[PDB]
Subunit: 295 residues, 4 copies
């Protein structure tokens, strides 16, 4: 037998960081969950009990906090690139660092219509994430994303004209509910290393903002022919607004809301145009995926 | 043996309802999870296999949808009272109906600075809940609450002067992080029945708004001596602003953020005044409770 | 305003303990999650920022580990009683200690048909729990339970003869699936203090074993007329086998499995006697409760 | 813009199936959660609102139940292959079917030392899974796995000799706790189609059994030099016992149990040889991965 692939490190490292402006008293907080997995000349730790090649996961944990202490933790694309670069530069035998960061929301509170200098609220479990793969001799590959953005529209969603055969029971509809949890990923052009990442720092926050804004506006305004058609429109627009992105990926569940026929009860009408009460379905759910690139 | 207590029904009933304004095109959505448990002369279903006394849980489920179809689902205090009242009035042998409602957030989207007529976003897993106990001959007892309101302040929290003995290792602090998940309950004066509940309908939304506003403002502005002291201030203010409430209950975890001593590493200073990077602790957590009433 | 009730302490304290037999090499592990909440003359911590009355939750945490170090952690009824007793005896102003313990399963592995001296497997998320309320001048009240015991029977469950009216759509059935997650609680006679608890130590493990054995055997062998009827039989038997228990409580969801009519597809028969494929329903679910005592 | 990749279908389809022996009265149950995602000439559903190319996800759901009705659902490798094959053979424009199956445990109960004909218990959340990719012109690729197998050993785990530098604080140890959640995957030689899968049916259950048995025995008996070294031994043995497997993948968290120094309290000794009480750490955790193939 032989090791064909191997990576190891520390997962689920919770990190908080605060910035305090000594002049204004305004404080700003950041919270994330970090995973760092390393690859390199480490096969003998698996095959020969040779731990000398292992950078202990406990040490990787320490390194995550130390790096957050000495560097900005925002935008996460930059932090992840600095962290990953550290491992491949520090250890000669480590050749790739895989950094995943989940950013948690801490939005400044408004109290009496004025932003508070040091109080925050978790407004939704929506996350901003990055996957930063730092590979020696192959630069830095970054995938940025937003996830857990849960939305619903109560009309202006349709689904008709689909294939009908002996397995089909679904009725065509010209007016249905559409609800999903948005998982959207934009994949950046390869970067040659940390300097190139630094040269584009402002584009990371800007592109995340565009992705979110396009997602929400398209969802709200598209009289949707299907999840497929709507998600494609989102991807197209994001690609047109940031030329440094190569592809856009969407992963969308169709979280179904079923009509409830109540005509068995005193002839109550609750279907079609009379539909007011629906049953949200926890499972199963449609799952619709696509990766969109440049023609 | 004998039945000392018994209640049964349907839990986890997901319900959506939409309101459509035919004139303006504006739609409004409501989503909840409902539990209804009944008590009454039902002991023989347990002791003698006598199912004739059982209103099937499947039927309770149907009744929840039918009631949502024929009545407003807001405020949840009203809906729960109508639902509970139905069971005790409809079935002679049913003497209590216990209705729990969890309201899910569907906040209208703003697109290009203008509210959208039929698109919504789940802004946080914060819930608005009610527990409505409808008991024949004993009126309606309502407990309203907000839960899952997750907040953090990065300073203006203290904890010193606590008891110190041979079990104590915690250092006193004059500046720490405070984060919690707010669970706040206001208990209403007993109502004699559904008419009395109806007579106070506007106070339900108003009191929920006050509870939330007081929670947030007190959390942000109190230079906290402890969780205990801060939560008490919240309770006091809510009681002073709604005389129909008898008590206010708070349940607050202290979700700890620990300093990370990094001086072992190149003498890095990250404690006390130099503290920037912290380790959020998933567990354990302090848990602080109190019920506040009128003197 | 005034404090009407208050309790505080530390929740979610994970604890592991190992016992090593120096003679045989056999090791035995215990793992639990502990919550300790205290009551007493502590109202001024809430109303006057008087932290001198507070035993810090961090100290309660330390005390949990120290007590596990100096005392057996099994049976959990005993450990919880020792822990709770400590707080009310150690602190004059603390008058009640509320101890909740969740015991996690670590079952010894069998390797090549022989029990292994120090390797364990988590065989199910089924828990064994206790709630031990130690109240000064009122002894020790213990509620023991098993929870998360998930079971299914594929026949010998029925439900017919229930009430039918204009809200009823459920068909009567003489053969259905029954699945539930068992939550069973036995409430012990009040104990005057720790000595009395100690005098009954062997009965705690024995009664837990009986409760589980009765639950499983009754579930498997009862041709069930309803959840209500079956759970009552379980409670009766447990009460008859341990006279130190006063009441038995069951909390059982009916986790529904629905038939799937496939006759629309090539006349496939999958209902009634031909039912082979079913759709498990995640929600909603029936919820059936009862507390059984002695006549 | 252009579609670079696309797949869609139904996720989280819960399925139960029962087998009844008319002669013996013995019944056997199977429960799973199924996902089916399709690829093919479907890009116009995304780019041109052309739903004619869409096999509705609702129809995919129906097809999953119909296929379970007409075919054995065990072993899951076979069921997934039959299901995936159906879609690519039935629809000319569908060229790949991706089938994921999670099998849930329903182990027959033993009552009074005798196996019960129709009562089952969920003994752990451990799952048996398959990923079956059916691609037209490229056969069937199957990955089988076990997951959520949670284990602990209280000694005979070591970790010393790892790299030590300015980022290192971890002490070397010659006796520690090792606990993990086993995720083990065996990847089968490509199969040319469903007939070839059928020709190996008995090997699927046998290889799952071997994987589990090897996992448990190696975990229990290896005086472990590291997670890396131990997992490699498992992979090697599985590969040596089934020549139709090409690679074995392990994904193992190191779920840390920390010593608790209590010497600050009355000089209590709870470290090293005196270590009895430990603090399980929920996060962070080491994460160790490797894919092992044939040399
Ligand atoms: O938008 C939709 N896309 C689909 O592919 C589908 N299938 N069923 N319902 C659906 N809705
Ligand atoms: O606010 C706090 N209250 C407490 O009771 C406590 N105990 N430890 N830390 C604490 N912080
Ligand atoms: O056992 C049952 N009890 C009930 O009360 C019930 N209601 N619907 N189905 C049911 N099954
Ligand atoms: O088995 C282990 N492997 C590792 O790579 C490691 N790092 N810290 N502790 C560890 N334990
Ligand atoms: Na390197
Ligand atoms: Na009545
Ligand atoms: Na006392
Ligand atoms: Na095809």
């Amino acid at each position: 037998s032989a090791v064909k692939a191997a990576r190891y490190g520390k997962d689920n490292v919770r990190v908080y960081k605060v910035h305090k402006d000594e002049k204004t008293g305004v404080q700003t907080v950041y919270e994330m969950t970090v995973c760092v997995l390393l690859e390199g000349e480490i096969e003998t730790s698996y095959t020969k009990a040779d731990n000398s090649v292992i950078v202990a996961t406990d040490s990787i944990k320490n390194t995550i906090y130390i790096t957050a202490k000495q560097n900005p933790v925002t935008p996460p694309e930059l932090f992840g690139s600095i962290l990953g670069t550290h491992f491949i530069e520090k250890y000669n035998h480590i050749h790739a660092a895989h950094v995943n960061i989940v950013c948690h929301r801490w939005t400044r509170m408004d109290i009496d219509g004025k932003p508070h200098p040091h109080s925050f609220i978790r407004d939704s479990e929506e996350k901003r994430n990055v996957q930063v793969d730092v590979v020696e001799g192959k630069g830095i590959d970054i995938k940025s994303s937003l996830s857990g953005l849960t939305v619903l529209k109560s009309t202006n969603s349709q689904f008709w004209g689909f294939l009908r055969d002996e397995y089909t029971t679904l009725k065509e509809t010209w007016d249905r509910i559409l609800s999903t949890d948005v998982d959207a990923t934009w994949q950046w052009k390869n970067f040659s290393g940390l300097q190139e990442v630094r040269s584009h720092v402002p584009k990371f926050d800007a592109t995340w903002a565009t992705a979110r804004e396009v997602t929400l506006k398209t969802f709200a305004e598209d009289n949707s022919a299907s999840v497929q058609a709507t998600m494609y429109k989102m991807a197209e627009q994001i690609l047109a607004r940031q030329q440094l992105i190569e592809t856009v990926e969407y992963s969308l569940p169709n979280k179904h809301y079923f009509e409830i026929d109540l005509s068995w009860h005193k002839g109550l009408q609750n279907t079609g145009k009379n539909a007011e009460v629906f049953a949200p379905q926890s499972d199963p759910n449609g799952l619709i995926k696509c990766t969109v690139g440049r023609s």
